[PDB]
């Protein structure tokens, strides 16, 4: 928006306003992956901490 400029009455001149402005955008997003594995060699023979 802007302020109107004064014009004289007899010379019937006027003012106009600029139109709107519309654009477009897009968004990419991140992907996360996590892998873990359980193998019996990490369970066999191993001792539970805090237990005799």
């Amino acid at each position: 928006i802007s302020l109107l400029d004064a014009v004289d009455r007899t010379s019937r001149k006027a003012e106009t306003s600029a139109p709107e402005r519309v654009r477009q955008i897009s968004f990419p997003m991140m992907y996360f992956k996590e892998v873990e594995s359980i193998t019996p060699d990490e369970i066999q023979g191993v001792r539970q901490p805090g237990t005799a």
Binding site: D8, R9, T10, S11, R12, K13, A14
Partner: protein, 124 residues
């Protein structure tokens, strides 16, 4: 008085000279000037490009005809507006032109005719 007579003044002409004009919303035949200093404007006088009147010899300029009564000393106008405006494009007007002195009318009218201004014969 001490001369036996006092005149309070002829009334300045009104803006009745316009008969037909383009009625575009922002004004097609109306052009806006800026007063030259100490210059008195009345409706019906032919104006040059730089707001000045057409003198003898320079009939070819003839940019427009005034349609307001501007008063020079107080810098205001017939209707209280800071600018002087004239008809400069295609329109039909009564031939109640005010021409300075020496300015023939045939050359002035021909210059105005090339710009689209037509003069309806008027009569009294």
């Amino acid at each position: 008085a001490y001369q036996g007579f006092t005149k309070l003044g002829e009334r300045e002409p009104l803006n009745d000279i316009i008969l037909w004009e383009e009625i575009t919303p922002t004004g097609h035949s109306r052009k806006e000037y800026a007063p030259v200093a100490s210059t008195e404007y009345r409706v019906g006088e032919v104006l040059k490009a730089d707001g000045s009147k057409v003198a003898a010899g320079q009939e070819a300029q003839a940019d427009s005809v005034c349609i307001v009564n501007f008063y020079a000393d107080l810098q205001l106008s017939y209707h209280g507006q800071l600018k002087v405006v004239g008809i400069y494009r295609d329109a039909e007007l009564k031939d109640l032109l005010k021409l300075e002195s020496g300015v023939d009318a045939a050359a002035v009218k021909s210059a105005l005719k090339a710009k689209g201004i037509d003069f309806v014969p008027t009569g009294l």
